[PDB]
Amino acid sequence: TRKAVIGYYFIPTNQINNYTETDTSVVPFPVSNITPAKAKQLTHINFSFLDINSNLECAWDPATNDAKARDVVNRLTALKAHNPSLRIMFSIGGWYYSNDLGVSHANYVNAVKTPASRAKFAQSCVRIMKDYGFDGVDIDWEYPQAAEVDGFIAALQEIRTLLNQQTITDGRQALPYQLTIAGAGGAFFLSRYYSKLAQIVAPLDYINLMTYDLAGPWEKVTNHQAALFGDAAGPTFYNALREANLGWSWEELTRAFPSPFSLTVDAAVQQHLMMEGVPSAKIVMGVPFYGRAFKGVSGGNGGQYSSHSTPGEDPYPSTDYWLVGCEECVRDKDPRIASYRQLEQMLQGNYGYQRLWNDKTKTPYLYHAQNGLFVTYDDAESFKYKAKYIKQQQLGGVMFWHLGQDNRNGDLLAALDRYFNAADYDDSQLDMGTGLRYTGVGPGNLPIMTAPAYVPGTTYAQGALVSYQGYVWQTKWGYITSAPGSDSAWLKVGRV
Amino acid sequence: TRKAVIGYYFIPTNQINNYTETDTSVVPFPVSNITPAKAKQLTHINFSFLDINSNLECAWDPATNDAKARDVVNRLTALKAHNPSLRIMFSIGGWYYSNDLGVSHANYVNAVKTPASRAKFAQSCVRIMKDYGFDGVDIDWEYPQAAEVDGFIAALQEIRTLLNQQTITDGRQALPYQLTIAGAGGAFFLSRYYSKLAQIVAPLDYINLMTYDLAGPWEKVTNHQAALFGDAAGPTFYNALREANLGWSWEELTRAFPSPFSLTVDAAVQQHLMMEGVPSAKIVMGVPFYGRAFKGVSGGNGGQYSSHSTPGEDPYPSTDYWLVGCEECVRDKDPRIASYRQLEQMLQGNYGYQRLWNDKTKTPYLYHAQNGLFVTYDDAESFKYKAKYIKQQQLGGVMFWHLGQDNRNGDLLAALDRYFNAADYDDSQLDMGTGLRYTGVGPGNLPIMTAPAYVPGTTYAQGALVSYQGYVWQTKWGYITSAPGSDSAWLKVGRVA
Known part of the structure; x- marks a missing residue:
């Protein structure tokens, strides 16, 4: 399966209201710069950003000149002529609009509160998609908090239902309408909804991890903002996931979430794979x-x-x-x-x-x-390792912010496309190095193991392994007289 | 309020059937060794053990000569003539009958399963109680776990309801029928039902902690089986409570359950106290x-x-x-x-x-x-510290296994009685030592704390303290823009006055 290559096309309201393809002073990166060749190297373009208004519906910025907006979007969708697999998605949210202290935060919180609020919000996402000619919906709320998660989940489900119906109604079986979200790429924000990752990911074609900005001026120590693997010499951080509302035991929390740990791209990807029901093919790695x-x-x-x-x-x-x-x-x-x-x-x-x-x-x-x-x-070199990791970990693909930041020749995008698709590029000998890998083990990434079947009536010593109900379990202490799943002395350590 | 002094009187079926007060080789400890003086030193005697049969009702071991059994119990209830506060409870269970691999284990599990089975079992408990002349019911299941706990709780509530009505019916308001259980005195077995302790203890007059057998042949290092406090030089153990289904965050579990830890009497008592809704007055310290x-x-x-x-x-x-x-x-x-x-x-x-x-x-x-x-x-000396601990911690009293093991003069029981009640005994200056205390904190023994009210729209740094919805909370990392509560960033660390 072709790896997804998802590029954001971001354009400020003032640049839309003043759209031009001949004056980089007003519009630095016009649609015209996405040449046919770049169009074929992308699978998705996420047009950004739309918002959720006080009416609790998906909507453009109130100051946007709708006529100029339609014209920009039409130029993007025209690119599909060059690549029949291309989808022009639209993104709702972004840090500015949706962060806790952002201008429209209450609208996100409110939009997902009730069955009726969700229905109306979902309906608006599809109407906007159909009216402007988009090929799918991407939600970038940064980020729903524990108590808002169930509502967020229900809203995504609602959208998924409406999109699947629209795909059939429009005869788009060949290129179905899609739903994606930009997800946290670091444990602090990820801990907000981590416990319900499976439910969040079920209605999506992809969860695009924002595995960047992992370092910045808000941190005391300079660091790489998107290290693939960890460097023991760099800073380490508190593993916020051990505090998510998982309901797991101390041993379970500890082995899944070593703390402190290296905040890396690999950490975020592995943290998602540790959860049951989060398929690797839906995980997309973001790059800056x-x-x-x-x-x-x-x-x-x-x-x-x-x-x-x-x-x-x-x-x-x-x-x-x-x-x-x-x-x-x-x-x-x-x-x-x-x-x-x-x-x-x-x-x-x-x-x-x-x-x-x-x-x-x-x-x-x-x-x-x-x-x-x-x-x-x-750069194109760091992208060799990230692309090889995506292939080895069987991830859905790569996402990046943003198209206007690539050089004039589009080298970064071309490199990503090359690493996934060029018949003459061979990374079989590319050395992934000795940087630190994230080694937590959770429900979703347990190693395959074998062990004698558990036997009712037997007393087990500390450290004994048995198979039961499809998993391999180990005792945490001795003189265990009851079964795995009923007696808390057992720790699930392997599968099959 | 007088401290409870609960002594088990255990007698094997073969001893009941051949009961005699004039042959120590047959009956090493007949009831006649319990003189009026000793009777006055006790508040409860737990006759042991009865069981739960395949019909799922409380019952004597079928091999018991019934007349001989009544005679033994009569000898015990006659002791009440010397102490108007004394109760002769009967205990159902014990390790042999009720452990997971014990001979009657399935009967305990099945008796508490449904409303119908619980009603039947409870009724049988009150019938036996009245039939033989007992004053209360003690359940000694070692120990319910997993899916059995809810049923166990419901059965205890049912027995409670039935005993309370029996009390009124018999005009026993001056000496109400009581209900107690023998509880685990060590974290490994305690972890089986720990999360639901408040519910288990609600229908009880007392929960008698089996705070002994904390060391034995089954362990590889020699140690005190009932240390009051810890000795840094002795072995330490894995704190099993951290694996119970509590729903606490890593920080909360770590703060409540230091591990490894010293398996002591003080540890068990403090572990019960860390749970909200478990009053110290119902906790009874067992001693061997x-x-x-x-x-x-x-x-x-x-x-x-x-x-x-x-x-x-x-x-x-x-x-x-x-x-x-x-x-x-x-x-x-x-x-x-x-x-x-x-x-x-x-x-x-x-x-x-x-x-x-x-x-x-x-x-x-x-x-x-x-x-x-x-x-x-x-011995009498270690009991001084345990008795002072009971008073200091405001516990309900002491329990012991068992009466037959006291010396002929009954010095151990007399000591316990003296320490709680003698006007001429004064432990006001008894030094409790520097042994290790159990210092876990669980929302249940969360301290009063004071902090500025949380301010919505504010960004808090790591370690910041705020008050919100009845508790004081601390941030575990920085740039916190979310409100305290379920949100992962905040840790409950105190209660608001």
């Missing part, structure tokens, strides 16, 4: 097409794992654009983020940057020794 | 009137915490009776257990036992330097 920059770093590790003096607040609470060479940072008034396109130019401009490589995390980074700058980002 | 012996002890620490080579199977497989001076052991064919009466005599003979004391555990032990023997037991 931008880097995060820090100032005030020390030496000795090329800028890595250093204290820094970068403001973590948003918006950027200053006017000092200190990321040397970053012209884009000036137009966007923030030196803490830089598109791969801009980073590539910075590197070729003799601005004092050195490109270093961390072979544990399998990610690149820039170090500016003169000014004390550090930049964590991804 | 017997000791456990081990052979093969390496010397150096008086035989404490040493490897040993004592058989663990039951019955005793050998014929080798290596407990020097324990003739009782010879009669009973087991050198691994001996009554305080017998241990006192062995201390008396010229056998070479050194009576030693562990000041952390507040318990005595014997050490036979010569033959490499170690005996863990309790």
